[PDB]
Ligand binder design. Structure first.
Ligand SMILES: *CCS(=O)(=O)Nc1cccc(Cc2nn(C(C)C)c3ncnc(N)c23)c1
Length: 261
């Protein structure tokens, strides 16, 4: 047992946040630290499989990645992570607080996410499941990447990844472009009214989502860059981070708030 093990008695599960595989709870660690806790229902997934999420988070540490705190690594297994007080970005966008978000806030959230993914990019990892349901929001609209699908949902997956299993940082870039549409539509499902197979077929034929209402063309253009057919033609996360951080000075200095963005 490495330095990450904690005593089972040091961990209190207070409120259940999600179910599934296992559960997610808000709780307390050492009676003083607010935390998020993921459980594994014994005999529903390989312990080695479930813990893989924790192996990755021991090596990846960055202010825009939900931080690993601790593990109880024998069945019943617990993974303890940083508590993110505002829940999933997806529920956030859809809910009462989403209503009032405007383009400056939404681009700043995108820049944060892009910053976490630039880190992942520098570390030579791959996320594989980047999307708004896997970003968590904290105090002051901080957004952090969570739920690594692995290390190194067809509507969010680059075509080369979905078809041939070629998952790379560049298929994450594609997913990020899709995440940008979730941000600018307040969390609507991408490709509205299309089923998975129609999406895959149309994306192959060069189909791409149009510019969302009130979203500047310059931001939709960035989405289009993330969606280039050739993976190696897509921008880096270092590029996306910089572009989004500088957006309101370098790209749309004339931005005026509208009804929804
Ligand atoms: C150590 C971070 S991790 O992504 O690898 N594992 C982990 C462990 C516990 C909880 C989460 C993600 C999560 N989900 N939710 C609700 C269900 C939307 C949370 N609320 C608050 N805080 C966190 N971390 C939440 C990830």
């Amino acid at each position: 047992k490495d330095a990450w093990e904690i005593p089972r008695e040091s961990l209190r599960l207070e409120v259940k946040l999600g179910q599934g595989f296992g559960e997610v709870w808000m709780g307390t660690w050492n009676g003083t630290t607010r935390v998020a806790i993921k459980t594994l229902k014994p005999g529903t997934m390989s312990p080695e499989a479930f813990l893989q999420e924790a192996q990755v988070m021991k090596k990846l540490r960055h202010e825009k990645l939900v931080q690993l705190y601790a593990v109880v690594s024998e069945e019943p297994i617990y993974i303890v992570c940083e508590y993110m007080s505002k829940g999933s970005l997806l529920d956030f966008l859809k809910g009462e607080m989403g209503k009032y978000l405007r383009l400056p806030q939404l681009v700043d959230m995108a820049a944060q996410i892009a910053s976490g993914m630039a880190y992942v990019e520098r570390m030579n990892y791959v996320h594989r499941d980047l999307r708004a349901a896997n970003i968590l929001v904290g105090e002051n609209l901080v957004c952090k990447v969570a739920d690594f699908g692995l290390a190194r949902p067809i509507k969010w997956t680059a075509p080369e990844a979905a078809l041939y299993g070629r998952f790379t940082i560049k298929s994450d870039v594609w997913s990020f472009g899709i995440l940008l549409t979730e941000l600018t539509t307040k969390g609507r499902v991408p490709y509205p009214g299309m089923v998975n197979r129609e999406v895959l077929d149309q994306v192959e034929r060069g189909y791409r989502m149009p510019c969302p209402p009130e979203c500047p063309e310059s931001l939709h253009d960035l989405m289009c860059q993330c969606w280039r057919k050739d993976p190696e033609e897509r921008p880096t996360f270092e590029y996306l981070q910089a572009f989004l951080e500088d957006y309101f000075t370098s790209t749309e200095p004339q931005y005026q708030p509208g009804e929804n963005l």
